[PDB]
Write a protein that binds this ligand. Structure first.
Ligand SMILES: [Zn+2]
Ligand SMILES: [Zn+2]
Length: 890
């Protein structure tokens, strides 16, 4: 297809009033009988009807009960009762056959066949284990039957499903079940009819058929309505659903208290799917989850995966209002529901777990994955202007930066002002398909606030850079002068970047008071120009606390002495800025040691001793009593390597890895006695946040106690591995052991495989922990694991567990190019059956320009090999075309 543009939107020529679907479900060939009740838009001349349709085996076309034949050269001579198929497979009916009056309704009935077992794209109807499941977002419903496959077309649905009674005892679709019984002529088959009373776009359609067990629990809304919440899964996993069920109940209660949102259906169903591209999908009343985001068990699920399940479960329920009842006018507005819903699950996770812990996790993920995207060839604003394949723009920018943009609304307007904007947003657009500007206008109108410049967050890509050009205390005036500058580098298709509306939370820590001296302690500064000076009231000499709570998704250039950083590490009040001060000091040490290693390529690299400021602060955090142990663990943990690499030019993952290990080993020697004392204090599975924090700090201290990677380190990690009562401490010890070549690593990996007992999720970790190992010939191990009996590229979770994890290994960038070729060979094979996963796999080649010339030539070679592959998908073609946009021709 050709490139699509945001400003080319136009309402549809025709409307869809009713959808009558009949499914004759078989694993090899499913018949889909569909009747669409349509009419032309008012005040519009007659025009041809064009319906989306992809990979359908068409049997018959019927217009108002009259059969139409396939247009051919023989039908041209005389037959006018014909239909046509365009070059893309869309169903075309000439305007002469349709009613002349616009309001006159007509019926288009089609019989098509699809092949679920051959549907390896996992879009539309396909087989997943013992289940027949669906996935339609964004444009997958056209792979089931003909439709106007766009989110601004809504209609009422009536769905009938017929299937084998033994293989598919449970049949599910959107809405309420109105009929169930046996198939009349065919013995052994049964059916069910589902009617959705509320109109919905086609991407929210879903159907499930297979052998399912369920747990359930009632929920009473604030109006008194009772909603039956049920979690479905295959029989073998039906005892691992309580954590997901309890998460739905918390999400429904939280949305009522925090935003006044009330569920409107009698049933809320969640079905687990073992073969799923996304993490979960918000199909109206019939959510479908990836198994890794639903199933939970103490012996298989880590604390982080437990929290991720709670977060995604809430995310999918929050889509019922921000996504389903108020939906998108077009796919350029994807961040209207994704950015707003991610922000909603971030507030939810913060209230359910720890606010500071969640904020630190979100910022670290943003400044690694999203910052790389925003500085690369695929950089796009949260509301893109153009796209080729819409599946390529379900990105960290649209999701996670979009949430940071929503959070900036909350910062500028306050909680009560943000709530008033939400109420007006839901009141105006309930049951409609709207845009980003509608949400921004709701926030503006409800608060009397001008948000015209704020739209630049939606229009301009790239990470803004905020420089602290001057920050000096003025004792004569009792003022603190703060001068700030902002600039944003060019991104593909947009060189000039106009100033953003940047809210910057600041604070001052008095040098005498050792606490906040501002009242209120945090002040929201509105940086709206390219350069601006602010004057804060400071009674005494102070130290600046800049960008508290990460109030804007920007880079910060702020020169601080190690003494002022140590002052903030000990006396700052903002939880993020307190951690940011420690993260800033450790990042600079990591970055400098990596540049020394990068200068000599590891040939005689001598590191200066770690400064006492860093070690004493590390020791104080380690020995501290009474504080939150999760904040303790995240402060002591070394900075994420992908985050530090985004500040380097060029990026050298091997130099950054050696820099990380050298710091890990030096602090392990300097504070070995204190580390061993705290480690023994954290011994002796509960889901309580107190026990999660204890295990989190215990695993971090083990990392600092095993840096030498000698026989003593392997023995300590092996005991941690064997004595673990859950997956959290077991997987952490295994991950540490896999960097230590020896018998302890092989024994742990062999035992880990057998202890899985065929569990696909535990086997994913077994593949991933090997792909991320810092061992020699880790590439050859990954290449060999592709032949393993339990490896199949057709399952996205298993493919990502091995291949995607390997792309995050620093040895993936080995200068011999063996790692790049491995990914390219994988992307080529996967693209022939699952374009979505292959396009995301090829994304690891996007930042080729940021690496050294040797790695540039190797990555450019694989990028061109993929781009020149015959039959390459539209999805993967767009990704590598963008990557090669700034590359030499030929
Ligand atoms: Zn989603
Ligand atoms: Zn979402």
């Amino acid at each position: 297809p050709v490139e699509k543009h945001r400003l080319d939107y136009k309402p549809t020529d025709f409307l869809i009033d009713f959808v009558d679907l009949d499914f004759d479900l078989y694993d090899d060939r499913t018949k889909v009988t569909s009747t669409l009740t349509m009419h032309r838009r008012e005040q519009t001349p007659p025009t041809d009807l064009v319906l989306d349709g992809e990979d359908l085996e068409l049997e018959s076309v019927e217009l108002d009960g009259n059969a139409l034949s396939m247009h051919s050269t023989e039908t041209q001579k005389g037959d006018k009762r014909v239909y046509s198929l365009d070059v893309d497979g869309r169903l075309v009916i000439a305007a002469d056959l349709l009613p002349q009056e616009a309001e006159k309704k007509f019926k288009v009935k089609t019989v098509v066949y699809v092949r679920p077992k051959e549907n390896l794209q996992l879009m539309g109807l396909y087989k997943s284990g013992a289940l027949l499941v669906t996935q339609c977002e964004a444009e997958g419903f056209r792979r089931i039957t003909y439709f106007l496959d766009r989110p601004d077309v809504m209609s009422l649905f009536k769905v009938r499903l017929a299937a084998d009674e033994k293989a598919c005892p449970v049949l599910l679709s959107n809405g309420n079940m109105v009929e169930s019984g046996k198939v009349e002529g065919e013995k052994g088959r049964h059916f069910a009819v589902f009617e959705d009373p509320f109109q919905k776009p086609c991407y929210l359609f879903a159907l499930v058929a297979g052998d399912l067990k369920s747990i359930s629990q009632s929920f009473t809304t604030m109006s008194g309505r009772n909603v039956k919440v049920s979690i479905f899964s295959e029989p073998e996993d039906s005892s691992k659903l309580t954590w997901a069920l309890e998460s739905v109940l918390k999400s429904m209660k939280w949305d009522e208290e925090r935003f006044g949102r009330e569920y409107d259906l009698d049933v809320f169903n969640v079905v687990c799917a073992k073969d799923f591209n996304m993490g979960a999908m918000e199909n109206k009343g019939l959510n479908i989850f990836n198994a890794a985001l639903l199933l939970a068990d103490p012996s298989t699920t880590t604390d982080a995966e437990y929290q991720r399940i709670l977060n995604v479960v809430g995310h999918e329920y929050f889509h019922q209002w921000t996504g389903n009842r108020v939906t998108c006018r077009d796919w350029f507005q994807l961040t209207l529901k994704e950015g707003l819903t991610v922000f909603r699950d971030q507030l939810f996770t913060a209230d359910m777990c720890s606010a500071a812990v969640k904020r630190i996790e979100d910022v670290v993920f943003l400044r690694s994955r999203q910052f790389a995207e925003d500085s690369g060839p695929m950089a796009h604003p949260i509301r893109p202007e153009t796209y080729i394949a819409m599946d390529n723009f379900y990105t960290a920018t649209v999701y996670d930066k979009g949430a940071e943009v929503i959070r900036m609304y909350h910062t500028l307007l306050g909680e009560a002002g943000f709530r008033k904007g939400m109420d007006l947003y839901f009141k105006r657009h309930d049951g409609k398909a709207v845009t980003c500007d509608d949400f921004r206008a709701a926030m503006a109108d409800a608060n009397g606030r001008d948000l015209g410049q704020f739209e630049r967050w939606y229009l301009q890509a790239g990470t803004p850079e905020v420089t602290v050009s001057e920050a000096v205390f003025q004792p004569d005036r009792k003022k603190f002068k703060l001068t700030l500058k902002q600039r944003t580098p060019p991104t593909p298709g947009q060189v000039e970047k106009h100033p953003f509306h940047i809210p910057i939370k600041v604070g001052l820590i008095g040098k005498t008071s050792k606490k906040d001296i501002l009242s209120p302690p945090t002040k929201v500064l509105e940086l709206t120009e390219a350069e601006q000076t602010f004057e804060l009231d400071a009674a005494e000499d102070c130290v600046l606390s800049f960008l508290r709570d990460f109030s804007a998704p920007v880079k910060v250039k702020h020169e601080q002495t190690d003494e002022d950083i140590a002052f903030l590490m000990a006396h700052d009040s903002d939880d993020f800025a307190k951690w940011q001060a420690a993260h800033t000091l450790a990042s600079g040490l990591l970055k400098h040691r990596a540049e020394q290693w990068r200068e000599k390529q590891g040939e005689d690299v001598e590191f200066a001793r770690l400064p006492k400021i860093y070690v004493e602060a590390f020791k104080q955090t380690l020995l501290e009593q009474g504080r939150d142990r999760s904040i303790q663990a995240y402060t002591l943990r070394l900075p994420d390597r992908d985050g530090v690499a985004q500040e380097m030019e060029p990026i050298d993952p091997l130099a950054l890895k050696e820099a990380t290990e050298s710091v890990r080993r030096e602090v392990g020697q300097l504070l070995k006695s204190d580390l061993l004392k705290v480690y023994a204090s954290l011994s002796a599975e509960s889901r309580d946040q107190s026990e999660v924090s204890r295990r989190r700090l215990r695993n971090v201290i083990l990392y600092f106690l095993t840096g030498e990677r000698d026989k003593e380190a392997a023995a300590l990690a092996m005991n941690h591995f064997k004595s673990a009562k859950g997956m959290t401490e077991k997987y952490a010890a295994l991950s540490i052991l896999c960097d230590i070549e020896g018998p302890e690593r092989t024994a742990a990996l062999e035992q880990f495989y057998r202890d899985a007992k065929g569990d696909p999720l535990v086997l994913d970790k077994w593949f991933a922990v090997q792909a991320l190992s810092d061992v020699r010939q880790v590439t050859e191990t990954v290449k060999e694991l592709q032949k393993h009996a339990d490896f199949t590229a057709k399952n996205p979770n298993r493919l990502r567990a091995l291949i995607f994890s390997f792309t995050r290994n620093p040895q993936f960038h080995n200068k011999d190019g063996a790692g790049y070729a491995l990914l390219a060979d994988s992307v080529l094979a996967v693209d022939r059956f699952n374009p979505q996963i292959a396009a995301r796999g090829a994304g690891a080649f996007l930042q080729w320009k940021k690496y050294d010339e040797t790695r540039q030539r190797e990555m450019l070679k694989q990028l061109r090999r993929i781009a020149n592959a015959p039959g390459l998908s539209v999805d993967t073609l767009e990704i590598v075309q963008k990557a090669l946009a700034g590359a030499p021709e030929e």
